[PDB]
Amino acid sequence: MRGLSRRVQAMKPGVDLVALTAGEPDFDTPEHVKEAARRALAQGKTKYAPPAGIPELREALAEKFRRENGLSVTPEETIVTVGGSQALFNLFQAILDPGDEVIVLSPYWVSYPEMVRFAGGVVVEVETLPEEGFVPDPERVRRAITPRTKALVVNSPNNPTGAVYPKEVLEALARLAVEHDFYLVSDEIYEHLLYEGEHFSPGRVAPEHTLTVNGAAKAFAMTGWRIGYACGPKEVIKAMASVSRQSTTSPDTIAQWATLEALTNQEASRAFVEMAREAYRRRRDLLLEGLTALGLKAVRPSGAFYVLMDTSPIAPDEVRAAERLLEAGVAVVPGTDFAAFGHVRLSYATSEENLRKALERFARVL
Amino acid sequence: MRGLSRRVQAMKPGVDLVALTAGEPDFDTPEHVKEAARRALAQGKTKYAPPAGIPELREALAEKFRRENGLSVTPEETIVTVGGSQALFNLFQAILDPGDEVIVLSPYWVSYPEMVRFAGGVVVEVETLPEEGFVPDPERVRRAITPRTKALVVNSPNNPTGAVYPKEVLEALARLAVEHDFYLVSDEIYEHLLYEGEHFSPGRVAPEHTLTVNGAAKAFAMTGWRIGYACGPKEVIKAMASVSRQSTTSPDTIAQWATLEALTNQEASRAFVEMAREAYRRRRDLLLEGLTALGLKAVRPSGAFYVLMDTSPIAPDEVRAAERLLEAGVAVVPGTDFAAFGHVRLSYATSEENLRKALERFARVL
Ligand SMILES: *Cc1c(COP(=O)(O)O)cnc(C)c1O
Numbered sequence: 115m116r117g118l119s120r121r122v123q124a125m126k127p128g129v130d131l132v133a134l135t136a137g138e139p140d141f142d143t144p145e146h147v148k149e150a151a152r153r154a155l156a157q158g159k160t161k162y163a164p165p166a167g168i169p170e171l172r173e174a175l176a177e178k179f180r181r182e183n184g185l186s187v188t189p190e191e192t193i194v195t196v197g198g199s200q201a202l203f204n205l206f207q208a209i210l211d212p213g214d215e216v217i218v219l220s221p222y223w224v225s226y227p228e229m230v231r232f233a234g235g236v237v238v239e240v241e242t243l244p245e246e247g248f249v250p251d252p253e254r255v256r257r258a259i260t261p262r263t264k265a266l267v268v269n270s271p272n273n274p275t276g277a278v279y280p281k282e283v284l285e286a287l288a289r290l291a292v293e294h295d296f297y298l299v300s301d302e303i304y305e306h307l308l309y310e311g312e313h314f315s316p317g318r319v320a321p322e323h324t325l326t327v328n329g330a331a332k333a334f335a336m337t338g339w340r341i342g343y344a345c346g347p348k349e350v351i352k353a354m355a356s357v358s359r360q361s362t363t364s365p366d367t368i369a370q371w372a373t374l375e376a377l378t379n380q381e382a383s384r385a386f387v388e389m390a391r392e393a394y395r396r397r398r399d400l401l402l403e404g405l406t407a408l409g410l411k412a413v414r415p416s417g418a419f420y421v422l423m424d425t426s427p428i429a430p431d432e433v434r435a436a437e438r439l440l441e442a443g444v445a446v447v448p449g450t451d452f453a454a455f456g457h458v459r460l461s462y463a464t465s466e467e468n469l470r471k472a473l474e475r476f477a478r479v480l
Numbered sequence: 481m482r483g484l485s486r487r488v489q490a491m492k493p494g495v496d497l498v499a500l501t502a503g504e505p506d507f508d509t510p511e512h513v514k515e516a517a518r519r520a521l522a523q524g525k526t527k528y529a530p531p532a533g534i535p536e537l538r539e540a541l542a543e544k545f546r547r548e549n550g551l552s553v554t555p556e557e558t559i560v561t562v563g564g565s566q567a568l569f570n571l572f573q574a575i576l577d578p579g580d581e582v583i584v585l586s587p588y589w590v591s592y593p594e595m596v597r598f599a600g601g602v603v604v605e606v607e608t609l610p611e612e613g614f615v616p617d618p619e620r621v622r623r624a625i626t627p628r629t630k631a632l633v634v635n636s637p638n639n640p641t642g643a644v645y646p647k648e649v650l651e652a653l654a655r656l657a658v659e660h661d662f663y664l665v666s667d668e669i670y671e672h673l674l675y676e677g678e679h680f681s682p683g684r685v686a687p688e689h690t691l692t693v694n695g696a697a698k699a700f701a702m703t704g705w706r707i708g709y710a711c712g713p714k715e716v717i718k719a720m721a722s723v724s725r726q727s728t729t730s731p732d733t734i735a736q737w738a739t740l741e742a743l744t745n746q747e748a749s750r751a752f753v754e755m756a757r758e759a760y761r762r763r764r765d766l767l768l769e770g771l772t773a774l775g776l777k778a779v780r781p782s783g784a785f786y787v788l789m790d791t792s793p794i795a796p797d798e799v800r801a802a803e804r805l806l807e808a809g810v811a812v813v814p815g816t817d818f819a820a821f822g823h824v825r826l827s828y829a830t831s832e833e834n835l836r837k838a839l840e841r842f843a844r845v846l
Pocket residue numbers: 196197198199200223269272273301303329330331332337340341342728729
């Protein structure tokens with residue numbers, strides 16, 4: 115018989131426009147990384163790499179996680195994947211049996227529920243409130259815990275809210291994982307795009323319960339390179355490598371060598387990060403002041419490069435709001451898929467010039 | 481609770497040695513491809529690409545499948561993946577429900593049964609015979625079809641046997657798919673590594689039943705670049721792209737542009753293919769001559785760069801034979817995992833000098 119599988123069928127799908135929809139940096143990847151790619155090419159590093167990644171990168175990864183995040187991990191508790199998205203996908207395929215529950219915090223990144231469902235898992239949503247700065251209340255999270263809870267996904271700095279969760283909240287969530295015996299999945303890819311506060315990694319207190327996901331995509335403007343990395347309990351990392359072996363085999367070898375340079379040349383990478391960070395902060399401040407002057411509401415973000423804007427004054431719902439803004443000349447992302455109803459996601463990974471235009475057009479819509 | 485999933489737990493795991501174990505070309509990727517990669521880097525083509533691949537590549541793919549294989553496909557019935565392995569992985573995830581049966585022809589590439597079972601499928605094995613040159617008998621296949629058959633996997637040129645199936649057998653297999661209504665998965669990555677006969681794509685006789693899987697890996701010495709491609713029914717291709725979107729997002733952008741060059745610069749690419757084909761042919765003959773002189777049995781391959789050697793004269797079984805050979809100084813791959821019992825896979829993707837060195841050491845295990 116022909117026909118698609120159930121898992122795949124259950125899956126969810128001359129005008130001048132100013133686009134504020136980007137999910138990737140506007141900067142190009144820094145030259146030290148590009149140069150390392152060039153050396154790898156000339157050195158013929160074009161062969162298959164091990165499923166978990168070239169050993170040199172795994173070693174550098176163990177250093178980064180300990181040095182930057184205070185995580186006590188060995189090279190064997192580290193894995194290189196085809197983007198942070200594959201680290202999350204392999205993780206769910208490795209820990210979820212049909213019916214296992216995963217607590218997700220809304221608004222959430224679009225891919226989380228999809229990946230959980232694709233593995234046969236059940237999504238259990240816990241909402242974070244705009245009035246609480248989109249920071250989870252551990253008390254609301256406890257109520258979502260059942261005997262079937264397998265994992266809890268935390269994403270700070272957050273996409274799409276831009277919220278940075280305080281260490282006390284993160285410690286409280288790590289404690290629930292330990293007390294109730296489940297995995298804490300910490301998506302930390304925006305760690306370096308932080309304007310205020312500190313980036314705390316829950317793996318610092320509960321390493322055997324925490325799976326830390328990260329990558330080069332957002333920090334080093336390497337979205338198209340497809341290199342992500344994770345660390346955590348040795349047995350889970352081993353299982354994740356098994357999934358890669360039977361799907362992608364291993365990430366692009368040239369990209370792995372280029373990523374090694376981003377991690378080892380701390381001086382050049384630090385210079386890129388500080389430059390981008392300062393640019394993003396100026397853009398964020400520019401946007402927020404403008405929105406406030408218009409009377410539009412948005413919780414001030416402390417990280418990433420997104421702003422969730424309440425659309426109540428523009429239309430009855432976020433899709434109608436998004437279509438009106440489109441007519442006005444501004445492309446925004448409706449909050450529907452992120453479970454951010456009544457909001458629209460704005461991205462400031464564009465020029466100040468474009469942010470000014472967009473504010474002019476919002477003005478006209480009001 | 482914590483713990484690994486069943487699908488992951490069910491998964492199967494001073495000496496001078498000459499290695500005849502390679503599953504990739506010894507040649508480095510051609511300069512024109514490397515140059516295309518440098519241009520993309522210089523041009524800032526480092527951003528996210530669409531889930532099915534950059535439009536330029538999907539169009540070049542349509543041309544390739546039409547031109548080289550006589551397949552009539554549009555760019556939309558084309559998909560780019562992270563290696564041909566991901567094409568197969570996404571395919572099974574997109575077409576298999578737990579319990580669905582997939583017919584595989586032994587000896588088979590190690591990854592087929594693992595990919596089938598990971599998606600919940602049941603592996604039904606149909607044996608090909610040494611006496612029949614490892615070419616399948618359509619009758620034996622017919623005898624394996626049940627109401628639960630979802631697909632039949634065919635790989636020609638074959639890994640690990642090196643057999644090239646005649647157009648007439650490929651047509652008979654396609655007909656069974658059309659006759660019994662199931663998918664025909666054609667793994668054609670070794671099409672350009674052919675020494676005698678001609679490559680026939682069964683998608684020509686059963687377009688709506690066939691998924692043609694291919695890639696740049698073996699033909700252009702690009703195993704580490706991780707770029708594969710497939711074509712087939714629009715609805716299946718669309719479903720495969722959906723799997724990519726929630727797992728890898730899209731293959732590395734730099735590698736996609738480099739692959740476009742390998743497909744469009746026909747003059748430089750054919751020069752490489754013909755150069756490699758010539759070298760492989762030399763190495764094959766040399767290896768076969770040597771074995772024959774040693775009194776060792778092996779079926780003469782017409783494609784790829786492998787030879788399945790009968791280990792009867794060496795040890796009771798192929799694992800023991802592989803161990804004796806190791807002591808003798810030659811590393812070979814036991815036929816165990818390919819369901820090629822009593823055999824050992826030899827790869828001639830190495831220099832003639834190494835092949836000569838191995839043949840010399842073979843004298844010690846008689
Ligand atoms: C970008 C992103 C990732 C991973 O991106 P990759 O490009 O696959 O590395 C993971 N989580 C969030 C919230 C992201 O925004």
